[PDB]
Design a binder for these strands. Structure first.
Ligand SMILES: O=c1[nH]c(=S)[nH]c2[nH]ccc12
Length: 267
DNA sequence: CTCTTTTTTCTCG
DNA sequence: GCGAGAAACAAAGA
């Protein structure tokens, strides 16, 4: 999941578990709780969920006044709300039980993580990760963006994926964004001219906000997304580009599968 | 059978 | 510092 999917999950959860007292917490895979499962179980049991926030691709459960549970879904994490008598499925790892249902985390690849941290440590947590601004007009300052691009000789796609120029892009939306901004994924950032950086900036915001409105891409909470029907290049190798009669090509860039339209995305 | 494919952190040179 | 490659892991396809 990328920012749009995580935000969809955040919204569904917010409407359903906020106000719910945690009756108990159980784990078949305690190892994904990086700060210690027993400590998390002791601290959160009996607490009421106050809210759910999000920063980049990170889910943030506000639980009691003084704790936050930072959940990352990584590649295939999935939450669902189930009745208490629901049967365990093979890749279920954690469950948070309420009086009238339960929140189950499942993750085939076991990459997802939970971290318990205190409220006044949330901002420091994200500062230490150097997570960039949220992809909104109010937060994503183009001027700083522009100066960071001009100082680097990194390729634009992997640099955007680092989450430090701006938060929330992953492989799908970085490919869509670069297609929309007519930029080559291996373009070195210091060769980007001002007008391209401007288009890149706005496209990042516009694509991510559109995907949020369409409830994310779906290829469980957040499983009713429609953004996948609007994808222009990701996973569409060999099919025609929607800007010219060329075909989508797929290459490897700094380890990632990369879909782009050669003719519309020259350096 | 082998090899490759699908977020973030770590290692090595 | 850097970039490349691999690692965490499971399942599927070639
Ligand atoms: O290289 C990265 N690619 C993605 S998708 N997320 C990241 N976080 C930190 C580094 C990276």
């Amino acid at each position: 999941p990328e920012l749009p999917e995580v935000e969809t999950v955040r919204r569904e959860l917010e409407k359903r578990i906020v106000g719910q007292k945690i009756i108990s917490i159980e784990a078949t895979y305690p190892r994904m709780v990086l700060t210690g499962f027993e400590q998390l179980k002791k601290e959160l049991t009996g607490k009421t969920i106050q809210g759910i926030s999000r920063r980049g691709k990170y889910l943030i459960f506000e639980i009691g006044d003084d704790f936050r549970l930072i959940s990352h879904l990584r590649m295939e994490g999935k939450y669902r709300l189930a009745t208490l008598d629901a049967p365990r499925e093979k890749h279920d790892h954690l469950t948070m039980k309420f009086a009238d249902g339960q929140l189950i985390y499942a993750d085939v690849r076991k990459f997802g993580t939970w971290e318990l941290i205190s409220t006044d440590q949330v901002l420091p947590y994200f500062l230490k990760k150097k997570i960039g601004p949220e992809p909104t007009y109010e937060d994503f300052d183009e001027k700083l963006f522009r100066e960071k691009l001009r100082k680097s000789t990194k390729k634009i796609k992997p640099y955007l994926l680092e989450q430090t120029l701006v938060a929330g892009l992953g492989n799908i939306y970085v490919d869509e964004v670069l297609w929309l901004a007519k930029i080559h994924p291996e373009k070195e950032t210091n060769q980007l001219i001002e007008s391209s950086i401007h288009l890149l900036h706005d496209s990042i915001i516009e694509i991510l906000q559109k995907a949020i409105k369409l409830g994310g891409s779906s290829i469980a909470l957040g499983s009713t997304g429609k953004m996948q029907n609007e994808l222009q290049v990701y996973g569409k190798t060999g099919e025609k580009c929607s800007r010219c009669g060329a075909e989508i090509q797929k290459i490897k860039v700094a380890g990632r599968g990369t879909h782009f339209c050669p003719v519309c995305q020259q350096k």
